[PDB]
């Protein structure tokens, strides 16, 4: 009926699983009528929906936005800011999901003013991609280099605690 | 139901309406084409806004995945890779790139496949026209791989939907 595959071990497959959980805690909420799909973990990203298939992270993406009438809420269509999330996601897919430190660094300065990398309100799709991509990097990382980039953890831990939910399966930081 | 809404001078509508072209030739009931402020496709009873949902969802709708992405090449990644760092750059064109677009293009016949147009073709002939459109002749040549695969494009790809007025 309505199916999701997915990958351990995948930061695309992660981000599938944030929206999940953000979509579960920010657009339905209590709300327990709302089905959500059966999450299983092979080695390709599909999604079964009705009749219809979706292939690999981006197609599901926009299926899934699609059913959960969620657009608004993720890409920030009330602050205007549609084009900006987009900048944002688009940019770090192309560089195939991976930050220099030099991006840390942008991102680590850019998070010193604000609570979400995009929004000035809540957390948006882009929290979400970037939050499943700086994890390992993050999870790995020495004291003494962590503080260097405070804000980010900052921003990091606030994710984890408003968001992660049902469907993620990342271990949790501190 | 069925009633897709493009910009007139919108390197994104332009996309839409190749994407649509790219349908007809490659891959072959369509939409009604209309131009008002605003990306917004209507299919159904869903209304889909900007270009990312309307695109998606024409994919869906014509099962052109594999064909406007090399799913075929296994190149799903490789031209998602294009069309996203293009779009990241807001559609314009550093002229180092067009420099290694140029020289990619010396020995391909298309930017990321090699067999058919794929979604980067479309992609990157909207987004190069208006600055080979408004090139002297001496720096056409001076781009001469790019200009030999734009009116590829152009004689094989432009249809009924695109407005685009043709070059040469």
Known sequence: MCVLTLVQDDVKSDILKLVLDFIKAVVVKDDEKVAFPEVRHEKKISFQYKDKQYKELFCTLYAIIDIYDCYNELFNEDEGKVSENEEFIFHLASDKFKLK???????????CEKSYIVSNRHASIVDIFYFCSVYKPLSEMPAKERVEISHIY?????????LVGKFTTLKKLE
């Open 101 to 111: 430190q030099l991006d840390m660094k942008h991102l680590n300065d850019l998070l």
């Open 154 to 162: 900052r921003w990091f831990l606030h994710i984890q605690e408003t």
